[PDB]
Amino acid sequence: HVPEKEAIVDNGAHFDGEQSGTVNGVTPPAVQHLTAEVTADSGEYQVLA
Amino acid sequence: MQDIRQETLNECTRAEQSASVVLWEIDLTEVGGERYFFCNEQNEKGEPVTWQGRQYQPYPIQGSGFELNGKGTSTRPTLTVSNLYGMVTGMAEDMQSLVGGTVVRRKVYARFLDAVNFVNGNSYADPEQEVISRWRIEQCSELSAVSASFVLSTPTETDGAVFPGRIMLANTCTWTYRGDECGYSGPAVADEYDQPTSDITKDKCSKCLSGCKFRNNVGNFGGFLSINKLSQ
Amino acid sequence: PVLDTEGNTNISGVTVVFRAGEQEQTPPEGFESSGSETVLGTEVKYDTPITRTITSANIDRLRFTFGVQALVETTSKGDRNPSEVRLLVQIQRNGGWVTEKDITIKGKTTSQYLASVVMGNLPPRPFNIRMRRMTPDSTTDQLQNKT
Ligand code: SF4
Numbered sequence: 001h002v003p004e005k006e007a008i009v010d011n012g013a014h015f016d017g018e019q020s021g022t023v024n025g026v027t028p029p030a031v032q033h034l035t036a037e038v039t040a041d042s043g044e045y046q047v048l049a
Numbered sequence: 050m051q052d053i054r055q056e057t058l059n060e061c062t063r064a065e066q067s068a069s070v071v072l073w074e075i076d077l078t079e080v081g082g083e084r085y086f087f088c089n090e091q092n093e094k095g096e097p098v099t100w101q102g103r104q105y106q107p108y109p110i111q112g113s114g115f116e117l118n119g120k121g122t123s124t125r126p127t128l129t130v131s132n133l134y135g136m137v138t139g140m141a142e143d144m145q146s147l148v149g150g151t152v153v154r155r156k157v158y159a160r161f162l163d164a165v166n167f168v169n170g171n172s173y174a175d176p177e178q179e180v181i182s183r184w185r186i187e188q189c190s191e192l193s194a195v196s197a198s199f200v201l202s203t204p205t206e207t208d209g210a211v212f213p214g215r216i217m218l219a220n221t222c223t224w225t226y227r228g229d230e231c232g233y234s235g236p237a238v239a240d241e242y243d244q245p246t247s248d249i250t251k252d253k254c255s256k257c258l259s260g261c262k263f264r265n266n267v268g269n270f271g272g273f274l275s276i277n278k279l280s281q
Numbered sequence: 282p283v284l285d286t287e288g289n290t291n292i293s294g295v296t297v298v299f300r301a302g303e304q305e306q307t308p309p310e311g312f313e314s315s316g317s318e319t320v321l322g323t324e325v326k327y328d329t330p331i332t333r334t335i336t337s338a339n340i341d342r343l344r345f346t347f348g349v350q351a352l353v354e355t356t357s358k359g360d361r362n363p364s365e366v367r368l369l370v371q372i373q374r375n376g377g378w379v380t381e382k383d384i385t386i387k388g389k390t391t392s393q394y395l396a397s398v399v400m401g402n403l404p405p406r407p408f409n410i411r412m413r414r415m416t417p418d419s420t421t422d423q424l425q426n427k428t
Contacts, residue, residue, distance in 0.1 A: 013242065015221065015255050015256055015257050016242070016243055016255060016257055016259060018220065018257055018258050018259050020220075025277075025280065026277050026280045026281045033395055035392045035393060035394070036392075037390075037391065037392045229304075230304075232305075268308065
């Protein structure tokens with residue numbers, strides 16, 4: 001036994017979706033405060049990042 | 050042990066037995082129907098059998114295959130009912146093929162029926178001696194224009210059920226509406242597709258984050274906001 | 282384990298919060314969910330403390346980041362010595378400018394070093410926030426302690 005009023009109810013939207021756009025995916029952001037220092041110790045130049 | 054009274058057990062020792070009578074009660078209140086009382090046979094007056102004051106009407110009913118066991122599969126006895134004049138089909142077309150109801154089988158001895166079933170009148174009547182079983186209808190394996198066969202099952206039988214009912218979700222709720230976890234009791238605000246309605250007959254949650262935000266119960270959301278656990 | 286049989290600590294700063302599953306329980310509070318960062322670079326001076334106003338609906342916690350231009354001190358010979366800088370951060374509580382938190386830095390560095398300190402915004406409604414420098418401004422060019 002099959003009814004005919006099924007394609008109407010089947011062509012119904014899902015639970016909205018609630019945006020869920022790409023925007024950003026898991027990719028980490030840029031590291032902040034990239035300070036680099038120049039020092040003179042033991043008569044030698046050193047740099048620290 | 051069984052809840053068998055002393056008198057019926059004592060009677061069930063002698064050689065000259067009485068007549069065994071089986072009566073059936075189909076209860077559909079839990080599903081949306083009524084209580085039907087059936088007996089395979091009628092009294093000597095051509096009248097429905099009177100037991101405990103109530104009446105069981107005659108109708109061809111036959112139960113076969115009652116096998117209680119602890120191992121192997123469960124018990125699935127078969128109940129056969131005559132479908133004449135379309136009487137069974139009438140409720141089957143209405144009560145979703147008699148699925149989910151309860152059946153109660155009571156067996157009694159002849160010498161304990163009500164006095165109105167005998168022309169002389171039984172002086173040994175005792176409307177408290179019977180053996181009772183209950184089962185649930187599982188499916189209507191075959192209902193033709195002359196008969197109808199139902200499969201029975203134990204209420205506590207497990208089949209197709211899993212133990213850890215909890216399921217971890219991302220953006221969908223897991224429980225019902227207003228039942229125990231959605232402690233919402235205010236006016237209707239949303240509907241199936243998250244539309245701003247204020248009518249109570251159409252208030253059903255969409256099982257989303259937006260529904261919770263609409264109903265201000267996001268603190269009671271069952272969907273953990275992980276999502277991105279497998280991408281990284 | 283983090284504690285042994287005797288009881289003395291075994292690991293460094295570890296914070297653990299446990300909640301048994303029970304209805305209408307309080308949510309966890311140690312960790313954040315969403316943060317809005319606003320950048321407005323300005324230098325705090327001893328004579329003119331810096332004031333800002335906070336006006337938002339959803340307030341749970343507020344984090345202040347503050348920086349130091351340089352801290353190394355050089356004498357006539359040329360030897361490098363660290364110095365001390367102290368700042369006080371205050372907010373509005375029942376109309377009183379009582380000091381909310383302090384900060385003190387002691388370490389030789391000539392780099393623009395920025396640190397962060399968080400606080401729990403218990404007072405509701407838009408309010409005001411300030412910081413004040415306690416170390417007096419350097420007169421010479423030898424001390425570069427600028428915050
Ligand atoms: S989603 Fe939020 S509102 Fe809809 S049922 Fe689950 S908990 Fe109750």
